[PDB]
Amino acid sequence: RVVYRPDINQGNYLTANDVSKIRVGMTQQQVAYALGTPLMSDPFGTNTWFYVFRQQPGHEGVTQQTLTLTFNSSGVLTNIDNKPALSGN
Amino acid sequence: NSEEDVVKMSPLPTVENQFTPTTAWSTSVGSGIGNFYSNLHPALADNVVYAADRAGLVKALNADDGKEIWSVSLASKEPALLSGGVTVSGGHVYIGSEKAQVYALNTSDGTVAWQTKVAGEALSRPVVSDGLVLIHTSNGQLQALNEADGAVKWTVNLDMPSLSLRGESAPTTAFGAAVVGGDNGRVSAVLMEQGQMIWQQRISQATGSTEIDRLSDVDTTPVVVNGVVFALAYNGNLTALDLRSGQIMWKRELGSVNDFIVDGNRIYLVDQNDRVMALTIDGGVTLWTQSDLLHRLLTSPVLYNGNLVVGDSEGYLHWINVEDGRFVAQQKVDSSGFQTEPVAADGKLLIQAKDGTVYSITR
Amino acid sequence: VDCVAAVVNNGVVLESDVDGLMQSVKLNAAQARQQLPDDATLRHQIMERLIMDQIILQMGQKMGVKISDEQLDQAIANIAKQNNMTLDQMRSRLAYDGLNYNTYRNQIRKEMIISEVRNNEVRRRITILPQEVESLAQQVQKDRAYRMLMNRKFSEEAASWMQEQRASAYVKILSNXXXXXXXXXXXXXXXXXXXXXXXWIAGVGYCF
Amino acid sequence: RYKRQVSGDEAYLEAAPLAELHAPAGMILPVTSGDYAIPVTNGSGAVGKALDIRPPAQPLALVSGARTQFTGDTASLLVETLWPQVVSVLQAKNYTITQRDDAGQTLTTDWVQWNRLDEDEQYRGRYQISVKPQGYQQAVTVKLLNLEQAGKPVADAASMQRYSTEMMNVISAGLDKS
Amino acid sequence: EVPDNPPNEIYATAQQKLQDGNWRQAITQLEALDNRYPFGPYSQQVQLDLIYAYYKNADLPLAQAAIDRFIRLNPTHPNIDYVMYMRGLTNMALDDSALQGFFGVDRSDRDPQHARAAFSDFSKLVRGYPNSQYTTDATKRLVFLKDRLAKYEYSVAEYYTERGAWVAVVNRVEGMLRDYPDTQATRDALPLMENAYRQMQMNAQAEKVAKIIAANSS
Amino acid sequence: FVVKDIHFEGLQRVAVGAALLSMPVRTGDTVNDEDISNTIRALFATGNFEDVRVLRDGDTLLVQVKERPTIASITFSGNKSVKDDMLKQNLEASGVRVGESLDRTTIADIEKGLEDFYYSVGKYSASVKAVVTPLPRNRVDLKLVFQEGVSAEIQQINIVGNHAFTTDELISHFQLRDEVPWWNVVGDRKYQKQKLAGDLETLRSYYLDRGYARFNIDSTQVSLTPDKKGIYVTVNITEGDQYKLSGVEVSGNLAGHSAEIEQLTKIEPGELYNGTKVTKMEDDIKKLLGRYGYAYPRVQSMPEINDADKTVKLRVNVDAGNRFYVRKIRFEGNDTSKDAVLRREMRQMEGAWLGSDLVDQGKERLNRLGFFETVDTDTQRVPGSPDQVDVVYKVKERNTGCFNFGIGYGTESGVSFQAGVQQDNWLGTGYAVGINGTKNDYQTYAELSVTNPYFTVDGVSLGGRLFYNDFQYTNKSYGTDVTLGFPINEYNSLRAGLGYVHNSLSNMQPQVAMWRYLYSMGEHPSTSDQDNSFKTDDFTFNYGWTYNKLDRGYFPTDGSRVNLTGKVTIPGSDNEYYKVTLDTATYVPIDDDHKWVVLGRTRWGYGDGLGGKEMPFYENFYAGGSSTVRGFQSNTIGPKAVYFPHQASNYDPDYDYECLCKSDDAVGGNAMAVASLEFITPTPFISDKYANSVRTSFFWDMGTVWDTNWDSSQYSGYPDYSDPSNIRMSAGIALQWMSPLGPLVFSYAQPFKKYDGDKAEQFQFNIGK
């Protein structure tokens, strides 16, 4: 509206250049080097890494992009899920 | 303001006037040495003397009358900063400068025979011998200039601790070898035909730590007689050592001198505390001392009629009897002060004041 | 029973050493030579020697130079050869003379380490121009006079360095050269947030 | 009392007890990396205002080389006619001697009163003084039999410690007065 | 300032001044006695009395300096637990320095470093000498300090919840869950983590904390 | 033989068994052989002794021990150029302090250090002597004798070796002085060692930024006369030759921001080589990279130089590195203000990529609040993961307000009671609260105001106020107002609100202005005699706009602040008017360290009526006093009240009530304009320990105010009040200090240009902002 709202950033921003080099079959060190340390990790049971990239210019659309990596209990990568988000709101 | 607490004890000289020496003339060369420490001093050659100032002008004088002969200015843009003591030889007069320029003038004609650029300020008096004039610049560099026209021959390199005293030492010539001082307490000898060393002997005895204030650089011209040479570091250790090699014939701790003379089987010098003193060249035995003058900022002692002539910053010229010391006379020659070394030759002496310029003194 | 004669920086020299080098080394079959000054006169120089040996010891310890036991045994062999007195019977000589095995080992370790420190420290600052060798040869050639020249430079520079170090070393003499043994020697009210009480003119001025 | 008192209030005694949250079925909570761990300890200790903050008394200085020694209820002291001196200082303080064996060098005094600028606590004491030699020297022992507060016997260790140390200090200062 | 005197009577009058409670005067005599005889027979008593006087006189920094000095140069002493407990008490008192105590303001989300230091001192005391008489009060103070730190973390998480920074909220709640598991502030703050997951469209992770809070709703 | 036991003598720093743990003799056990000498050596190796003397008078070790003394006090005489604080700090850093053991080695250590320091300062004829005086109980008192002789004077700076610039021009820029001007006393000719390195780098920079690249300093010599009075400095330079930029190449692991980097490196062909230019290029590249996240880049430049064509190629190698994310933000020092009041002024959200500009922007915003003395930021890397960082803000709290409660006057003259609280930070909650009530026989006043700057978490502020005036002629007035404000952008704020007031005054003095206002309002009573009353009520809407950009909040040293406030009546009230006021304070720094500042202050004000009704006289503008042209009076500048001839009127006592005659009394017009310029200098009597709290200024002030209602008839023979061309002027000196009781301002101002009825004063004291 009229009241000023500062820009809000809530996670590491990931670019398609570094996304395209991720293929199922690497270990923790390789993906950590390629993309960066994940801010959000599942603290319950299984080890899951969440790369969330969300912006908010203030009274516009809240752009979001989530990338969930599911690792097995051995240190190697198993599952990838890249969601451009924007599921409605 | 509150830090002017100097430990300064220079008693006024005891009033003991016996004889009556006087002056001959003054010349007023102009604003000369002034407060700036330097080595400018008049030189006498065949009834003609010469003088100069920090500004750059050089004057020639006839003896016995003090009449001008020819005056030139070696300025153009700014002072030439004349530093090298005026020396004369043959048909040339040589002068140094702080701008790394050495001037050689053609005496009677008063024309610039040449000038050349050296490495660093040329404080030391240019010494002439064997068709070469030697400059001991303020970098440890010792440069030989060809007598014909400039044309540096060899540049010997010497060390330079970074707190040295000003007034680097001019070398002396003996049997084809130049004996020179140094800024680190080491007396060197050099073969003055290609620039090769013979022996480099250290004579200083410095401590450490607080020694950052102790400098012990030899800025005195070494004197040579027979097979021995003599040297004096700033902080002590008078040395008499062999000409052939750096073999110390005999040393003494006292040292601490900036000017000395040797003659008549004895050595007459002044300590860094202005304590004029006499020694025996045989082994370094003290004949006598004269401790009336302390912290008075004396000058070089010169022989004249068997008397040691000295000066001070207050201007009073003192005569010392060569026999155990006694104030023969005190002359209120000038109020400017005496800082440069007096010259004595041909039975006649000259002293250039800091600003009063050359003064001719009679006995 | 023992005392300390002087203290130097960190270490200390005690009466044991001065007694050992004075009672056991003075004309008492310690090179004899039938020449020895007064005990009081030589006491000063022997104390100087002991304290300077100590000073050299800490100076070396600053660099921490270590010498191993094989060098000590080779030094013992050198002593045996230079005494024309073989190592086992030389050891017996030392044992009954007063210096037993451990004292001799420590003494040789100390003398070797101080000699090594002296040599390195002096030779690091020595200079010889390749010019005067020919001059001395002509006065007298192919390194014959070079050894003598280096020896003279060593003699001057070592003494100068000794004076320089002795002058500037912290020593306190508690009291209470050297010929040595000659042989067997190798090489309004207010309160305090803020509160002001003054003096109708009574007004509180407390500041949070 | 104003002194002998914790400066803060008592509001820290109403903290909610810590209850470990339980894990759900078939899922593990984040590990207890919480170095902020509280070891479990019994009670029987004064809390809040009931606790006293008082510099633990130590037997003071006397004749040189006299090593003091702590005990839970007693106090000891090495020294360098020591028993006659001790008897002398006790008489100087006018403490009545109920029992005395000079041969055994052991004595028992009367009730001694200790009041220290606080009301209802004019401490009274039953003390059994004794001396016996130890090694090359002699050792003085002050043994506190009983302690009373306003006529009420009490048994807290700190009070017995302090009021044995005070009596030991009385001897020690009296011993220096010789 | 006090006239030179042999130590016994000056110590006696310092003790009397402490007895009366005139701490400001007593510090002078105690400090003079400590200065004039640095290594006397009973300098330890002087140090302990000085610590007590400094703490009572609300002169905390000097008390802390003396406590650290005594710990350093007397590592072993029969009553070092008293000094440790007093150091912890000094830190905890230093935490509360404001007029807000008059109004009962919730001094929980202010600067907590003093609370952390007090927790460290009390935990060191409890782990060190669990047979002393200061242990129960130390345990109560430790519980209070842990709750206070948990409350501060919950306050930060609540502010970020209000702002709209969901990832910071998740990180803070995870930190509380990892470091303050058994406190009450973590139970209060778990719904904030659930709301963050719900707002950030990660439901599969949201129902997990929903189950955690539902099973432990009580 | 066998020793039975041990005995010692000294027990100060070493206990009975403390020494036993170290000595290898291990008595009470096996022991024998000269090894006792080794025991002595082991005991002394500890360093806790000064002398040891073993003795075997019996069969027990009689070890005489003389322990090293513990220093009793430190004292010193003769120190003039060196302050006691530096000496005691060095001693604390030298391992010597009261109560600590004394070791003789540290005596020589500190002697050497002090002598070297004096030799660096220039006092070459200086010597420090350390005297130790023994005292009973093995302790010492340390005396230091300083024989500070005389400072050496520098004589000349010689730049021998130059052939392209004047030597005087080269040495003009130097911090060291060759010849101090005669008309300059603040400067002198002392030789400080660091200044030599500084001006060597200055000369090097001078040649590097004028196309000279093949440049170096051959040598530097510091000669000293054999008097310790003359210091000569000589430097040898290699002039080299000028050069031209062949071109610039930027290569390396540049991030996706290559385009703007290339634009930044665009250099005009034919320019001269400047080292400052390339340093600025590197700093700009680093800042541009740090804005986008890469906080730790690596930028280097090798100027590959070809002398054949005198062309230099700038080869810039840039390695971006890894982007850094903030793990958490912590706050230290806020013992009173809570965490939210700090965290809400941030612009760097937690759990986001580090914007190195946002951290400093948040630091500035926190510094602008006005209740934090010093704010320090620190972006420190985590000890664990590579690309993580913790941002720490350290703030030092500042006292904000005061609580006052004082009864004054009295003594048969009247009780003068007053009380109040004035806080900008109420208990750290962030609220702004203010209550003030004064009670005296002559008049009674009360007011209250509460403002929340963050009613919602966007910047919205809500505030309200109540006020009450009633006293004697009689005057009563009370009212209420409520406003709210919101931010337009980073800097601007916009406010709107409404409120109502009620006034009632009676038995008013007769004077032209108030009668004019009444006739405008529609009441025309008698003029010579006054026994009338009047009542009014006003409902008004007010608005405002503030632009703020300041370095700090309490006497800032940068930026500017403009503040506009305008109130207009709503239809339905008794009066109809509109007022517009403007304020503008601007600061410009001239010194690099922001120590010398030029201040420009201005204030403007207009006010008038609506629909033919005059502006009420109880809200006119005023001037004088403090906060305006200072040195005249409180609210006296401008139009002066002129009274109609007096009559029966009110009760007129004899010897009292001595009131169209002209009077010096003032009433205030409805158009005001004042301005002022100030120069700020540091206090020349203190140091930096207090320099952040005291401000000294020289000021010039001008001010004027006039009445927009003019009569050709009534004002026929009276001064032209409606004429603005006449102004009042003043000048003087002002001193401000953040006293522990709030901000206090002192001023002395000689009245420069004043008019009739001003009663201008000289000394002026005030409390407030």
Beta-carbon separation of C12 and F741 below 8 A: no
Does F331 touch chain E if contact means CB atoms closer than 8 Å? yes
- The CATH number of the domain holding residue E29 is 1.25.40.10
d(CA B44, CA A34): 88
DSSP secondary structure letters along C99-124: --HHHHHHHHHHHHHHHHHHHHHHHH
Q: Which residues, at least 6 apart from F734, have a Cβ–Cβ distance to it below 8 Å?
A: F630, F678, F696, F697, F698, F699, F745, F746, F747, F748
F45 contacts in chain C (CB < 8 Å):
10
Pairing between β-strand D137-149 and β-strand D152-153 as defined by DSSP bridges? antiparallel
Check residue F427 and report its DSSP letter. Answer: G
**What count of Cα atoms within 13 Å lies in the side-chain half-sphere of residue F344?**
22
Phi, psi (degrees; rounded to nearest 5) at D79: -135, 180
Residue tagged 């004057």 (tokens)? B59
Q: Which CATH architecture has domain A8-83?
A: 2-Layer Sandwich (3.30)
| D47 close to E (CB below 8 A) | yes
Beta-carbon contacts of residue C200 (< 8 Å; ≥ 6 apart): F406, F407, F408, F409, F410, F411, F415, F416
Chain E, nearest residue to D156 by Cα = E133
* Beta-bridge partners for B197: B190
**Rounded Cα distance, B239 and D52, in Å:** 82
Pairing of strands B48-52, F372-381: unpaired
* Chain E nearest C-alpha distance from F334 (Å): 6
Give the side-chain half-sphere CA count within 13 A for B191: 11
* Cα E16 to the center of its chain, rounded Å: 31
Q: How many helices (H) and strands (E) does chain A have?
A: 2, 5
Nearest chain B Cα to C166, which residue? B207
- E182–D21 CB contact, under 8 Å: yes
Nearest to F327 by CA among F393, F391, F376: F391
D28: which 2 tokens? 């593990």
One-character DSSP codes across A16-39: HHHHTT--TT-BHHHHHHHH---S
Q: Are strands C12-14 and C4-8 parallel, antiparallel or unpaired?
A: antiparallel
Contacting residues of A for E200, CB less than 8 Å apart: 52, 54, 64
DSSP B265-290: TEEEEEETT--EEEEETTTTEEEEEE
**Could you tell me the two tokens for A58?**
């203030």
Q: Kindly report each contact of residues F215-221 with a partner whose C-beta sits within 8 Å and lies 24 or more positions away, as own/partner.
A: F215/F239, F215/F240, F218/F161, F219/B120, F219/B139, F219/B160, F220/B162, F220/F196, F221/B138, F221/B139, F221/B160, F221/B162, F221/B164
CB contact under 8 A, F458 and A5: yes
Asked whether at least 3 C-beta pairs link B and E within 8 Å, the reply is no
User: Residue F100: what residue type?
Assistant: E
Does D27 contact A at CB distance below 8 Å?
yes
Cα–Cα distance for residue pair F726/C8, rounded to 1 Å: 88
Look at strands F70-77 and F139-146 and give their pairing: parallel
Q: Name the nearest CA neighbour of D72 among A44, C180, E79.
A: E79
**C-alpha dihedral, F123 to F124 to F125 to F130, nearest 10°:** 80
Are D160 and D54 in contact, with CB atoms under 8 Å apart?
no
- Method for this entry: cryo-EM
| Distances from the Cα of D163 to the Cα of D113, D116, F216, angstroms | 10, 11, 82
Q: Which residue of B164, B213, B298, B299 to mutate against F (max F Cβ within 10 Å)?
A: B213
Are residues F299 and F325 in contact, defined by beta-carbon separation less than 8 angstroms? no
Q: How far is CA A17 from CA A21, A70, B362, F310, in A?
A: 7, 21, 100, 43
CB-based contact, E201 to chain A, within 8 Å: yes
Q: Is B210 within 8 Å of chain C by CB?
A: no
Choose among E164, E167, E174: nearest Cβ to A43: E174
As a dihedral over the C-alpha atoms of residue B204, residue B208, residue B209, residue B210, rounded to 10 degrees, the angle is -40
- Number of independent structural domains in chain E: 1
Q: How close is the nearest chain E Cα to the Cα of D8, in Å?
A: 7
Nearest CB to A12; choose among F256, F325, F486: F325
Residue A36 C-alpha, separation from nearest chain E C-alpha, in angstroms:
16
Give which of C9, C46, C50, C14 is closest to F54, Cα–Cα: C14
Which alpha helices (DSSP H) does F3-155 contain, by range?
36-45, 84-93, 104-121
C-alpha span between F169 and F178 (Å, rounded):
12
* Chain F residues inside the 8 Å CB shell of B81: 158
The 3 state secondary structure assigned to F505-550 is EECCCCEHHHHHHHHHHCCCCCCCCCCCEEEEEEEEEEEEEEEEEC
- Chain F contacts to B (CB-CB under 8 A): 80-81, 111-112, 115-116, 119, 123-125, 147-151, 155-156, 158, 160-161, 167, 219-227, 230, 232, 234, 236
Q: Could you say which DSSP state residue B125 is in? A: P
Task: Nearest chain F residue to A29 by CA: give it.
Answer: F385
SS3 state of residue B331: strand
In C115-154, the residues whose Cβ lies within 8 Å of chain F are none
F216 vs chain A: nearest CA distance in angstroms?
44
Q: How far apart are CA B155 and CA C170, in angstroms?
A: 44
Substitution target in F151, F159, F160, F229 with the highest count of B β-carbons within 10 Å is: F160
Question: Å from E174 to nearest chain D CA?
Answer: 8
Show contacts of F83-88: CB within 8 Å, 24+ apart: F87/F144
Tokens encoding E147: 């709750």
Report residue F106: phi and psi, to 5°. Answer: -65, -25
CA distances E97 to E106, F373, F621, Å, are 13, 18, 45
User: Could you tell me the sign of the dihedral formed by the alpha carbons of C57, C61, C63, C65, in that order?
Assistant: positive
| CB nearest A42 (choices: E171, E178, E205) | E205
Burial readout F607-627 (b: 16 or more C-beta within 10 A, e: otherwise)? bebeeebbbbbbbbbbbbbbe
CATH 3.30.530.50 is the classification of domain D53-178 = yes
CB-based contact A45 D28, cutoff 8 Å: yes
DSSP for residue B337: -
Report yes or no: E155 at the F interface, CB cutoff 8 Å.
yes
Using DSSP's 3-state secondary structure scheme, residue F87 falls into helix
Is residue E168 less than 8 Å (CB to CB) from chain A? yes
Look up residue B164 and give its two tokens: 């040295």
**Angle of the E43-56 helix axis to the E23-36 helix axis, nearest 10:** 150
Q: Where are the alpha helices (DSSP H) in F265-355?
A: 275-291, 340-343
The answer to whether the CB atoms of B200 and C136 lie below 8 A apart is no
Helical (H) or strand (E) element with B184: none
- Scanning F217-276 for CB atoms below 8 A from E yields none
* Interatomic CA distance for residues E202 and A50, integer angstroms: 10
Torsion of CA B97, B98, B100, B104, to 10 degrees: 0
The answer to whether residues B3 and F80 touch, using CB atoms and an 8 Å cutoff, is: yes
Q: If DSSP codes are grouped into helix, strand and coil, which group holds residue F27?
A: coil
Residue numbers of the domain that contains E198:
1-218
Cα R_g (chain D), whole angstroms: 24
Are there at least 3 beta-carbon pairs closer than 8 Å between B and C?
Answer: yes
Closest CA to E117 of E81, E99, E142, E98: E142
Selection from A80, F178, F53 nearest residue C7 by Cα: F53
Partner-chain contact F406 C203, CB within 8 Å: yes
Beta strands in F361-473 (DSSP E): 372-381, 388-397, 402-409, 415-423, 432-440, 443-452, 461-471
- Cα separation, B17 vs B13, in Å, equals 11
> Using the beta-carbon criterion (under 8 Å), do D55 and E86 form an inter-chain contact?
no
- Taking CB atoms and an 8 Å cutoff, what residues of chain E touch A44? 208
Please provide the DSSP assignment of D25-50 as one string: TT--PPP-------------S--GGG
Minimal Cα distance from D54: which residue of E? E52
Nearest to B278 by CA among B217, B232, B234, B323: B323
F339/E155 touch (CB, cutoff 8 Å), yes or no: yes
Q: What is the DSSP letter of A46?
A: S
Q: What is the 3-state secondary structure (H, E, C) of chain E?
A: CCCCCCHHHHHHHHHHHHHHCCHHHHHHHHHHHHHHCCCCCCHHHHHHHHHHHHHHCCCHHHHHHHHHHHHHHCCCCCCHHHHHHHHHHHHHHHHCCCCHHHHCCCCCCCCCHHHHHHHHHHHHHHHHCCCCCCHHHHHHHHHHHHHHHHHHHHHHHHHHHHHCCHHHHHHHHHHHHHHCCCCCHHHHHHHHHHHHHHHCCCHHHHHHHHHHHHHCCC
D-chain residues near E48 (CB < 8 A) = 55-56, 58
